[PDB]
UniProtKB/Swiss-Prot annotation, chain A:
GO terms for molecular function: copper ion binding. Homotrimer. Keywords: Chloroplast, Plastid, Transit peptide. This is Protein CutA 1, chloroplastic.
Length: 109, 107, 108
């Protein structure tokens, strides 16, 4: 049909510039239809025996399940951290016409 | 069975008034139990031969799977773009009383 | 290398509740990692009117396994008596991150 299986991928980054550049390569390389950047996140995790807290930005990446591999590759290749967060969540339904656009926007995999 | 299959729906909108109103209109019309508005989000995508970027906000809408078509029709009717982002994600539980109030406060 | 995991959305009513609940969450070994999204605005129906209040959003990355522990932990340290805690199924990613996620949390 019109309309490949899709996902929403969260990826966090340390700063504003990083976020904007990653969104550019993702979209230019045609690995996602669309990227929302949520600025001014604060992140909390346990590392080196204390609780750590860092200023970060969240990228919300609408794309194909197909490309989750090409995407995840791509985030690591382009990312200040060694273990960069990237997790996909499945899109089950939506505005049909947008999901088609999502398909046409995206690399063939 | 005090609990119906539920979704998180994402909708971007182009400005602060817009989403405030979409949200009002959505909730009023009983098409979702609630809407979180995330403001100041930047959206990047490919459009007319290059990398467009727009200032928007994000509506995270918690409603029932049953209501996704009604909610998607509503969003189109009340939204500036022709092909608005509306995408659904399935909930695999959580606070059961939340999930029932979700059921209850929705049609 | 990798137990079934999830993202958990949870709103708190202010800057401070979030900092504190994110701490106490990560402190008691309950999720690998917590993102606070400040200054969101939450709109819902309540007592016959459209309510709007300012809030924050915790995005909580953990294993399905801890969902209930977590929920029950939040209800303990959460000033609302019916917190929004909903969960969406993680289904893919940095195989590495998922391992770190796994390797940062309990079983029960």
């Amino acid at each position: 049909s019109t309309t490949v299986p899709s996902i929403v991928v969260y990826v966090t980054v340390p700063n504003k510039e990083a976020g904007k550049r990653l969104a550019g390569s993702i979209i230019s390389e045609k690995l996602a239809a669309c990227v929302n950047i949520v600025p001014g996140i604060e992140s909390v995790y346990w590392w080196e025996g204390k609780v750590q807290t860092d200023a970060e930005e969240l990228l919300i990446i609408k794309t194909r399940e197909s490309l989750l591999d090409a995407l995840t590759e791509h985030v690591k290749a382009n990312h200040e951290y060694d273990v960069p967060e990237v997790i996909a969540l499945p899109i089950k339904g939506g505005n049909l016409k947008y999901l088609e656009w999502l398909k046409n926007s995206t690399r063939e995999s």
